[PDB]
Design a protein around this ligand. Structure first.
Ligand SMILES: CC(C)CCC[C@@H](C)[C@H]1CC[C@H]2[C@@H]3CC=C4C[C@@H](O)CC[C@]4(C)[C@H]3CC[C@]12C
Ligand SMILES: CC(C)CCC[C@@H](C)[C@H]1CC[C@H]2[C@@H]3CC=C4C[C@@H](O)CC[C@]4(C)[C@H]3CC[C@]12C
Ligand SMILES: CC(C)CCC[C@@H](C)[C@H]1CC[C@H]2[C@@H]3CC=C4C[C@@H](O)CC[C@]4(C)[C@H]3CC[C@]12C
Ligand SMILES: CC(C)CCC[C@@H](C)[C@H]1CC[C@H]2[C@@H]3CC=C4C[C@@H](O)CC[C@]4(C)[C@H]3CC[C@]12C
Ligand SMILES: CC(C)CCC[C@@H](C)[C@H]1CC[C@H]2[C@@H]3CC=C4C[C@@H](O)CC[C@]4(C)[C@H]3CC[C@]12C
Ligand SMILES: [Ca+2]
Ligand SMILES: [Ca+2]
Lengths: 145, 96, 107, 163, 132, 48, 145, 59
């Protein structure tokens, strides 16, 4: 019912056009999310049997860390590091690589991929704005009929 | 001032109720055309004035004319909604 | 890249590697098998040659017209034509003076 | 047209993938270009570059999934069966990289490509990690260090799947 | 020749003249008109049903061609023809000469679109009505 | 048409023609997928 | 009083122009916020009488999750899941769908809608910059008078 | 029907003028006109030679 409006209708067609860029972003991030997630989950718990909880650990934090919610306090608790500095005086020396991996990952996801989507969205908008307006004018008759 | 008033009269008449009507359309286009031409003239002379002597041009824009209810050229330009005239640098220099 | 690569997928590509090594050893040392291929006929080769030459001529004709239909080319020709028109008239005046003299000495 | 080989150009990713996964049930009922027919269609379909790419993708995808399972699951006190499978797989990958080194336009042309660089980094990382585990399989510290090197291995493998 | 179909016998002389223009253009080698009529898989009156002698000797009639053009516009486009206006009893009706002109013009227009001759198409489009 | 008399132009676009299965010019324009015709202001004014 | 400045005055007219794009964004998000909010609040508390607190629960978290503040610790406490993994060993199996819904929602709001507003803002700015400058020059006389 | 036919004629007249007022069309006509001007002069020279001979045989 938003389609009858001149302001919102074209923007809904425009939204359906951007969905392809959103899908492109999802396919490119998926690579970094699964790579970092399997690596980070394995580094945090290197002596645990595979279960459904391992799989939930590979997809839960990595996905939500790309929206700015960084679970560093939770990661610090899970890593068994007792030092005043967040990643120090740990039981295993390998788990201290967990913040670096993360450091690479959010550089890949937030600084590189998110800004690239902003660039695609701007390009896509400029390309398909007139076509979206024309398609809205055809759908105006379709809705009237 | 006369070119600005001419532009305003042709633009407002072109959209007036006496020229409103389904058949009263080609006529309307011609007016708007004539209106912009007159607007162009008003801008153009103003530009020439600012090119020749900027201070005297400012004196002309500040001059109150008795024929139009004792009002200067910028007041009539604002009343005529001539955005092109108001955005010109000569006009902006007088306003400053 | 994927034309010359063996078909077998990676875990099983060792079979493909040992097969290529076996063919190379059988060809270099054993010299028992060989290579077979297919060669295109002269008829289809001349057909391709004839098609390519025709289309080359067609592109050159289309290219020449299109370059003569440009605005710059039309202005340039028009310019040369007006110059040639003067030259012709100039020859025409040269003739008219010669006539004037013919009547002048005729009086 | 060269990509699809002796197959019709209207074939989609899912159609070729379904035909690859179900050879006897989708191939006969398709249009292309008995023993000498089924054999002709196989010999034409699997020789296509597109089919070899698709086979290489799936193979690399299973490598990523199994290696990911191997690094997430705990390492046993001896060398496990999945570790032996991965050992055979990465030797095969190393031999394929050597074959690519020999049959190219020089070592420089091969090493210029970034995916080839990723292949060397992943073979180097795996063997370091494997030999680290295999030196002392019952040692807890060796298993921890081995999983630490294999974290980097999984990161490079998922990066190489973008190819 | 006489035809058993009652729709075909109702047709005027000019319709047979267009039929002759379609036939004459169609006999030339590699003509797209013959391929268009053959690949349609329809009968003589243009109905989508896919004896043989009428269906071949008068295969380029005007009604079938109207049906082919109707399928090329959309799935429910159906051009309505009224040839009853060409009889001599309707001569006294005012403006009849324009209506007779307009339909005639329309059918040659369609013929001129089919043979991709833009100039006569533009000319028959101008002569008739319902321009847009 | 829209330049000369807008109301009459609207009447022509709303007119049902017997020759084409009793359908107006916008219905045939939509059926012909003429995006340029449908996006025109005259057509949009009739649709509104 | 910012309008007398050449740098800020046009930007204030520009701000009033963008307000329409902001309103367009609000109307498009409202759909996802109410849909996700009613669904998520109902999934978290499926055996509670409707009250004013239910309505506050439908609009409070969903709106603030689009600015990066993800209440996942609070959602974990409210879901009654006792596991070390955030959404595991829960009393009801349906409440484990709460992170997925959220996963879809912030994909809809932050990745799609926010980037679309960036695109509109860029387009709107390029379209109405000269008109905003001209309107500021008319308002210069208006303020002087 | 009458309104539609008139406006069809009006658009064709406006369309023809507008296409004749383009820069390309004006350059092309000008180009054809200069060629036709030569041709005419060329006919004129043909005549002047014929005159020359008339006076030549006249002397
Ligand atoms: C090639 C690119 C990605 C750079 C690689 C840098 C890697 C090898 C570096 C960066 C930070 C490093 C870590 C920083 C600090 C420590 C603590 C020390 O007590 C043991 C080694 C350890 C855990 C390091 C391991 C190696 C490390 C992860
Ligand atoms: C502009 C940017 C790229 C600057 C680079 C910042 C990099 C070098 C910083 C940011 C966070 C850092 C990490 C933070 C904490 C730890 C844990 C510690 O036990 C070893 C070092 C290690 C692993 C650091 C390595 C270096 C690091 C990754
Ligand atoms: C090109 C890139 C991938 C190179 C990466 C190098 C990796 C595999 C190597 C380089 C330095 C290594 C670290 C060096 C020292 C230690 C301390 C030891 O007590 C535990 C292992 C640990 C933490 C190693 C883990 C593996 C490590 C991080
Ligand atoms: C159609 C699109 C939106 C995808 C839909 C995916 C839905 C149906 C999937 C994605 C994640 C799934 C949940 C993941 C895990 C569990 C825990 C299990 O013990 C019960 C089912 C439950 C709670 C699943 C329910 C179905 C679920 C919500
Ligand atoms: C690039 C992006 C789109 C990758 C996709 C990430 C998706 C598949 C991930 C991100 C967060 C994940 C959820 C996180 C936690 C839980 C709770 C658990 O009890 C069941 C699975 C479930 C519900 C997960 C389902 C899958 C999930 C929604
Ligand atoms: Ca390689
Ligand atoms: Ca006409």
């Amino acid at each position: 019912y938003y389609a009858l409006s001149k302001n919102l209708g074209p923007k809904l067609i425009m939204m359906m056009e951007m969905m392809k860029d959103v899908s492109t972003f999802v396919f490119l991030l998926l690579i970094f999310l699964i790579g970092y997630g399997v690596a980070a989950q394995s580094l945090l718990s290197p002596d645990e049997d595979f279960s459904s909880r391992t799989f939930i650990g590979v997809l839960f934090r990595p996905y939500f860390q790309i929206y700015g919610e960084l679970f560093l306090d939770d990661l610090n608790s899970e890593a068994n590091c007792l030092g005043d500095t967040p990643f120090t005086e740990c039981s295993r020396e390998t788990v201290r690589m967990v913040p670096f991996f993360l450091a690479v990952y959010i550089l890949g996801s937030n600084v590189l991929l998110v800004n690239l989507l902003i660039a695609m969205f701007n390009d896509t908008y400029m390309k398909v704005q007139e076509a979206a307006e024309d398609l809205w004018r055809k759908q105006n008759y379709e809705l009237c009929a | 001032i006369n070119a600005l008033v001419a532009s305003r009269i042709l633009e407002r008449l072109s959209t007036h109720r006496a020229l409103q009507g389904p058949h009263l359309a080609e006529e309307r286009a011609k007016m708007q055309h004539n209106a912009k031409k007159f607007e162009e003239l008003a801008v153009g002379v103003l530009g020439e004035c600012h090119g020749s002597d900027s201070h005297m041009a400012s004196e002309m824009l500040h001059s109150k004319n008795d024929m139009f209810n004792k009002k200067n050229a910028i007041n009539i330009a604002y009343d005529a909604k001539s955005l092109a005239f108001l955005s010109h640098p000569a006009t902006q220099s007088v306003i400053n | 890249e994927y034309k010359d690569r063996p078909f077998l997928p990676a875990p099983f590509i060792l079979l493909a590697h040992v097969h290529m090594l076996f063919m190379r050893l059988l060809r270099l040392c054993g010299v028992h098998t060989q290579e077979h291929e297919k060669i295109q006929d002269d008829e289809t080769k001349r057909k391709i040659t004839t098609f390519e030459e025709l289309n080359t001529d067609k592109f050159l004709r289309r290219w020449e017209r299109e370059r003569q239909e440009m605005l710059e080319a039309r202005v340039k020709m028009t310019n040369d034509n007006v110059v040639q028109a003067m030259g012709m008239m100039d020859q025409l005046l040269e003739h008219m003076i010669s006539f004037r003299f013919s009547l002048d000495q005729q009086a | 047209a060269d990509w699809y080989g002796h197959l019709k150009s209207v074939t989609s990713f899912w159609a070729v993938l379904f035909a690859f996964f179900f050879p006897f049930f989708v191939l006969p009922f398709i249009n292309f270009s008995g023993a000498h027919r089924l054999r002709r269609k196989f010999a034409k379909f699997y020789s296509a570059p597109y089919t070899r790419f698709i086979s290489d993708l799936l193979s690399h995808f299973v490598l990523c999934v199994v290696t990911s399972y191997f690094v997430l699951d705990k390492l046993e006190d001896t060398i496990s069966a999945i570790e032996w499978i991965l050992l055979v797989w990465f030797v095969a990958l190393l031999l394929e990289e050597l074959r690519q080194m020999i049959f190219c336009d020089g070592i420089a042309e091969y090493i210029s490509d970034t995916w080839n660089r990723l292949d060397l980094i992943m073979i180097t990382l795996f063997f370091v990690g494997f030999f680290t585990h295999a030196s002392d399989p019952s040692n807890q510290d060796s298993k921890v260090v081995s999983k630490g090197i294999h974290a980097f291995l999984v990161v490079v493998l998922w990066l190489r799947f973008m190819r | 020749a006489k035809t058993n179909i009652t729709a075909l016998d109702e047709l005027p002389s000019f319709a047979l003249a267009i039929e002759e223009l379609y036939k004459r253009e169609a006999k030339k080698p590699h003509s797209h008109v013959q391929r268009l009529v053959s690949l349609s898989n329809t009968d003589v009156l243009g109905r989508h049903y896919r004896g043989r002698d009428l269906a071949n000797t008068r295969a380029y009639n005007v009604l079938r061609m109207d049906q082919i053009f109707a399928r090329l516009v959309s799935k429910d486009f159906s051009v309505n023809r009224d040839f009853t206006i060409y009889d001599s009893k309707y001569d006294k009706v005012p403006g009849i000469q324009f209506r007779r002109t307009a339909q005639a013009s329309h059918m040659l227009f369609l013929w001129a679109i089919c043979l991709d001759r833009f100039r006569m198409a533009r000319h028959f489009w101008l002569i008739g009505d319902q321009s847009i």
